[PDB]
Amino acid sequence: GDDRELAILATAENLLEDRPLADISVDDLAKGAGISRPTFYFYFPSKEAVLLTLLDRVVNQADMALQTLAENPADTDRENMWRTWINVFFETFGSHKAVTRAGQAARATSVEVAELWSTFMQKWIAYTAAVIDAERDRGAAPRTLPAHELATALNLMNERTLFASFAGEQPSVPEARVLDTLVHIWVTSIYGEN
Amino acid sequence: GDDRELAILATAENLLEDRPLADISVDDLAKGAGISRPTFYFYFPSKEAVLLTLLDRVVNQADMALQTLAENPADTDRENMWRTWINVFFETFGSHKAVTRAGQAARATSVEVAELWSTFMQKWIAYTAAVIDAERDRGAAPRTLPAHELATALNLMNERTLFASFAGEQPSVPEARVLDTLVHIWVTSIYGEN
What we know:
DNA-binding (chains A, B), EthR_C (chains A, B), HTH-type transcriptional regulator EthR (chains A, B), Tetracycline Repressor, domain 2, transcription regulation (chains A, B), repressor (chains A, B)
């Protein structure tokens, strides 16, 4: 039942490590998960749809892991807060790299993926904005940019800066030194007057 | 001769406004530029290759426009310098939006496009890094992040922040208020101590 479903997915993920969706056939995922062609079609209606579901696993992994953090305020200095917020991306997407990458690539095509990714970003940008407003009201950060706008840029930086490093792009900040980077950019711009 | 070539391209660009490469045929670009199917193939060996050449026009437009600026130091305060540097992106890519978008989308596929875009970024990040080192040596910016690393993140933010706004994404900073945004992020992080 679900046994079968999950293998389709685990297999989806592992063939994705070394090659893009396109050059993975549909008998590719079947053969791997040890099921017949049409046994697959019962479970997922197209390969695109497999990739969708895995991305969904990942995003929610990162959604959930992110809300736990929100509800558990770490007890630390503002800089070490932001870092620990940002890190939850580095750890999640930085674990399922293969899916992470393909997901991004296929925003181009899937109006479903484009949506799925958008929704999550809006959620966290809005939340991030919410923080900054509060950081300004607690008095500890000054009122320079519209918060929601700042957040968007900062968050979009992350999405791109992070996924550049994962795919190991040319050019890109190495996994090691990233974070410290974004984190630095986050503090200096949130708390910075001029 | 070149008459014919250029029309293929102008047409390439205008059909791209309202729909993606994929759903533009090859008789699409011919019919538009008023030439026969194989007359086209003499000029460009595939549609992908048309898109390549237009992206090249744009990048170099922005490359050139960017080096003029470099060689003509604007006479203004550091903040109004960075802005006028960044603006040269907003104006270029923000003019050929259609090409700008498709180019990005098709980094996924074209190892030629991926290269073409990379090279340009490396160039400007390296240059941007070069500035910051100097800004630190003239004493006016403090030595916090490795410059080249900072530059990368800042530049990758731009690429993504900008092209999000162009395609008018959900979520994205509106064209109006962008710049002021990135610019703010640039100053606060370059000149910011903590």
